Structure 1
Amino acid sequence: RHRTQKEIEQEAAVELSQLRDPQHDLDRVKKPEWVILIGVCTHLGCVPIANAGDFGGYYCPCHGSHYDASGRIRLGPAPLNLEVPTYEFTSDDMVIVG
C-alpha cells in the first residue's frame, strides 16, 4: 500500500501506550509512504479489507476487526499487529521481498 502523506500524519499522531499491540509507526516501515504487510489477519486467519475501516486503513469483516493505515490493530478482537515481511528496495522502480 503506497499511501498519502496524511495517513502518515494520522499514524504518527496516534498515542503509543494506548495500542493493543504497541509499535512506533516510523520505526516499522522503511519509507512511510509505502506500507508492505502480510495480508492475513492475526486473529483467525481471515483477510482484512483494504482501503476501509475507521482509520481508513484496514478492516476485517469476519469479526469486525479494525486495523490502522499502518496495519496495527486497534479496535476489535484481533490481538497483535499485522506482520511485516522482510524486504528491500533495489532499483527505485522495484522492490524485492523475502
Structure 2
Amino acid sequence: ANAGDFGGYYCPCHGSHYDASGRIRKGPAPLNLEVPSYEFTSDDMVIVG
C-alpha cells in the first residue's frame, strides 16, 4: 500500500507498478484486479461476496 511509481498498489514479488485502482503499466503482470460481488449501504457498510 502506497508504493510503486504511481502511488497506488505495488507488488514486491516482481515489481509490478500499479495505479491507485491497480492497473499495470510497468512489469510482466498480465491483467488487472477483479471487482468482487459487493454492494454498499449508506450506513457505512458493504455486503461482500
Greater helix content: 1
Q: What is the aligned-residue RMSD (CA, Å)?
A: 1.1
Which 4+ residue blocks in structure 1 deviate beyond 4 angstroms? none
Partners of 1:62 and 1:78 lie apart in 2 by 11
SS of the residue corresponding to residue 66 of structure 1 reads coil
> Residue 76 of structure 1 aligns with which residue?
27
What is the TM-score when the length of structure 2 is the normalising length?
0.84
1:85 CA displacement: 1.1
Distance in 2, matches of 1:84 and 1:74, equals 19
State the SS of the aligned residue for 1:96.
strand
**Structure 1, residues 20-71: CA drift from partner, whole Å, max 9, x if none?**
xxxxxxxxxxxxxxxxxxxxxxxxxxxxxx1111110011111111111011
Shift of 1:91: 3.5
CA contact (8 A) 1:89 1:96 kept: yes
Report sequence identity in percent: 96
Aligned positions, number: 49
